[PDB]
């Protein structure tokens, strides 16, 4: 049963559009069941299901269900992989959200082979241990790694100034005088960045930017953290 949780840690975050709200979600489906993690950037919800739960719930939701749990799970996997990987891909699904106190019920309304399909995700508040493993620790790791990049680019910029100063030191004149770069000084670059650029650049919004520019680094950090 631990396999589902293991595969979940490696999954990136996808972006989903719901009734009025958008959610961030990662999911891992096998023949054994599934593990799902959802967040609205205020709270985090979790659900892990096995084959017994699948059969019971599918029978109750789709009254004329004559299918093994494995096939139902495979249909959910096939329905959700295109829809998540690109939030603009037209998968035959429609989502609704119900918040019952601390629980989140994610409802799916779809059509497979001209037949309607129903599934409800029963999510409880994610344990703090998973919030740490899936968000905090990786997010903190990403920030440290990005800060090393900034540092390596700044050294690279200082190296190019030593090169430009070698041209200025010698008998080297610029032709197009609109090309002159101001020598790079990190302290002033940060100061202008923090006043001029930070306001929009740190806006998390609906999590779309996070899913669009960082999932590659997210997957690299999680794999690193897990050896």
């Amino acid at each position: 049963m631990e396999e589902l949780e293991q595969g979940l840690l490696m999954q990136p975050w996808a972006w989903l559009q719901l009734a009025e709200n958008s959610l961030l979600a990662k999911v891992f489906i096998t023949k054994q069941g599934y593990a799902l993690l959802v967040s609205d950037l205020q709270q985090v919800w979790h659900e892990q299901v096995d084959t017994s739960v699948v059969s019971q719930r599918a029978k109750e939701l789709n009254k004329r269900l004559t299918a093994p749990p494995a096939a139902f799970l495979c249909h959910l996997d096939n329905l959700l992989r295109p829809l998540l990987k690109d939030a603009a891909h037209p998968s035959e699904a429609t989502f609704s959200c119900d918040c019952v106190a601390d629980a989140l019920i994610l409802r799916v309304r779809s059509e497979l082979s001209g037949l309607p399909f129903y599934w409800n995700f029963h999510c409880m508040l994610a344990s703090p241990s998973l919030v740490s493993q899936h968000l905090i620790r990786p997010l903190m790791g990403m920030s440290l790694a990005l800060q090393c990049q900034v540092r390596e680019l700044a050294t690279l910029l200082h190296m190019k100034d030593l090169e430009i100063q070698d041209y200025q030191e010698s008998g080297a004149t610029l032709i197009r005088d609109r090309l002159k770069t101001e020598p790079f000084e990190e302290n002033s670059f940060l100061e202008q960045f923090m006043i001029e650029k930070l306001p929009e650049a740190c806006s998390i919004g609906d999590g779309k930017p996070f899913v669009m520019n960082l999932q590659d680094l997210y997957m690299a950090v999680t794999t690193q953290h897990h050896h």
Partner: protein, 157 residues
């Protein structure tokens, strides 16, 4: 008042061919009569407009969308991608059919049919209808065949 007679195969008798006759009045949606026969016995059932709409709810399908599925399954206007299965128990007279997808199938409908008292009468009426249909079609095919000949000539000269 329309009708369709289709040839079907039951799961409990893949050997023998059965016939399904569905009749209605200006949409299946308003209700219909279904008859099943093996050329010896006959089983009939009625489906009210109310039952149809009820079935469309129990299945979680839009009423019109549901009637569309019935047309493909019962009036043999099913696509190659639409595979239908039919089951019947001569002991319970219960008739039901399912749609078959990739290794999974789903109950599409069910009827409690009643064994007919006068099968011969029913079979005779069905055959009568077929002959009238064959007749009407042949006549039209002839009228269109002559019009085709007239136009062929009229075009030339």
């Amino acid at each position: 008042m329309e009708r369709k007679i289709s040839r079907i195969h039951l799961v409990s008798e893949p050997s023998i061919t059965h016939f399904l006759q569905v009749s209605w009045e200006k949409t299946l949606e308003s209700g219909f009569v279904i008859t099943l026969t093996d050329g010896h016995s006959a089983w009939t059932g009625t489906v009210s407009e109310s039952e149809i709409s009820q079935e469309a709810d129990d299945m979680a399908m839009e009423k019109g969308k549901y009637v569309g599925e019935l047309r493909k399954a019962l009036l043999s206007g099913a696509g190659p991608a639409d595979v239908y299965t039919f089951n019947f128990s001569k002991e319970s007279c219960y008739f039901f059919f399912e749609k078959n997808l990739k290794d999974v199938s789903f109950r599409l409908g069910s009827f409690n049919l009643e064994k007919v008292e006068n099968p011969a009468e029913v079979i005779r009426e069905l055959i009568c209808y077929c002959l009238d249909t064959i007749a009407e079609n042949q006549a039209k095919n002839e009228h269109l065949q002559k019009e085709n000949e007239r136009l062929l000539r009229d075009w030339n000269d």
